[PDB]
A paper describes a structure:
Ras GTPase Activating Protein SH3 Domain Binding Protein (G3BP), a 52 kDa protein highly overexpressed in various cancer tumors, has in the last couple of years proved to be a significant cancer marker protein and a potential drug target. G3BP is involved in several cellular functions and is implicated for example in stress granule assembly, RNA metabolism and hereby cell motility, nuclear transportation and NFkappaB, Ras and Wnt signaling. In addition to the PxxP motifs, G3BP also contains glutamine- and glycine rich regions, an RNA recognition motif (RRM) and an N-terminal NTF2-like domain ranging from residue 11–134 in human G3BP1. The NTF2-like domain forms a homo-dimer with each molecule composed of three alpha helices (αI–III) lined up against a beta sheet made up by five beta strands (βI–V).
Initially, we were focusing our studies on the G3BP1 11–139 construct under the assumption that the N-terminal residues would be disordered and likely to interfere with crystal packing. Initially, we obtained hexagonal crystals of G3BP1 10–139 diffracting to around 3.3 Å. Two crystal structures of the G3BP1 NTF2-like domain, residues 11–139 and 1–139, were determined to resolutions of 3.3 and 1.6 Å, respectively. The 3.3 Å crystal structure of G3BP1 was solved in space group P6322 with one molecule in the asymmetric unit whereas two molecules describe the 1.6 Å structure in space group P212121. The low resolution structure was determined using combined molecular replacement and SIRAS phasing. The structure was refined to final Rwork and Rfree values of 30 and 36%, respectively, including 131 protein residues and one phosphate ion. Two loop regions, Gly43-Ala52 (loop III) and Pro116-Phe124 (loop VII), proved difficult to model but the electron density, including an un-biased density modified SIRAS map, suggested that these loops could tentatively be modeled, providing at least an approximate location. The phosphate ion occupies a special position in the crystal lattice, surrounded by six symmetry related copies of Arg107. The difference in resolution and space group between G3BP1 1–139 and 11–139 can be assigned to crystal packing effects largely caused by the N-terminal residues. Crystal packing is denser in the G3BP1 1–139 structure as compared to the 11–139 structure with estimated solvent contents of 42 and 56 percent, respectively.
Residue numbers in the entry:
A (entry chain A), B (entry chain A): 8 to 138
C-alpha cells in the first residue's frame, strides 16, 4: 500500500478541469469507464471500453470548466502491485451546484517506468442518483 | 465483465447479517479491510491486513443483527479476470438508523474452481463521516 494513487488523484481531477479531452491518455485498450448516467430511465448506465470509446463519452458529457474538491481518498494495493483508489468528494460541472460522488479507480502497471500507472477501471456515480 | 460480483454481494451482506464472524473466510492472507472509522479523531481509519487481523476488527465492531439493503452495485473486470465491485446502499447495525455508504470490493481468483473468488480488498466508508 502506497500513496501512488493519492498523487494520481492529484493530477486526474486537475486534468478533468483543465483539459478533459486529454483524459483518455490515462486509459489503455483494456479500461472500463462509467459516468453519468443515468441513462436514461433510472437504471445505472452501461460501461464503455477502449480508449476510442472512453474519450467519446467524456467529450459528450462536456466537462466545460468542471471544478472539483475531493474530501476523501482511499488508496491501497492489489494484484500485480496495482493500487485501488476510492474517491469521495464534490463535483461541479459548468459552475453548477456541488454533487457528492463516489468514484473507484483501478491502476495497473504501465509498462515503462511503471508510474503513474494507467486507469484500468473508472467507475463514477452521483449520490443524488441513488440516495 | 460479468455479474460474478453481483451474485457475490448477494451472499456477502447476507453473511454480514447472519454470521459476521464467518466473514473472514472471504479474505486471504493478502487482503485489505477498512471500516468504521473514524478513528478516532476525524481522519480516515487505517487498513488491516491478514485474515487474523481482519476478523479481529470485524468482531470488534459488533455487527449484532446488522441488516442491509443495497441500492446500487457496479461490477466489471480487471487484471487476472478479477471483478471489481462498487457498492452503494444503506446500512443499519443493531437496528439503528440507515446510513448511506460507499464500499469497494476487489475479487481475485481463488485457486480452486475460481468462484466466487476471494475478497482482496474491502474498503468501506460512511457518507455521514465525510459529507
Amino acid at each position: 500500500s502506497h500513496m501512488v494513487g493519492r498523487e494520481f488523484v492529484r493530477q486526474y481531477y486537475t486534468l478533468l478541469n483543465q483539459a478533459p479531452d486529454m483524459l483518455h491518455r490515462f486509459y489503455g485498450k483494456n479500461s472500463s469507464y462509467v459516468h453519468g448516467g443515468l441513462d436514461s430511465n433510472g437504471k445505472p448506465a452501461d460501461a464503455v471500453y477502449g480508449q476510442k470509446e472512453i474519450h467519446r463519452k467524456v467529450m459528450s458529457q462536456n466537462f466545460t470548466n468542471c471544478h472539483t474538491k475531493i474530501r476523501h481518498v482511499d488508496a491501497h494495493a492489489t494484484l500485480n502491485d496495482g493500487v485501488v483508489v476510492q474517491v469521495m468528494g464534490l463535483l461541479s460541472n459548468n459552475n453548477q451546484a456541488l454533487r457528492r460522488f463516489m468514484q473507484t479507480f483501478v491502476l495497473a502497471p504501465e509498462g515503462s517506468v511503471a508510474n503513474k500507472f494507467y486507469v484500468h477501471n473508472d467507475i463514477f456515480r452521483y449520490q443524488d442518483e441513488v440516495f
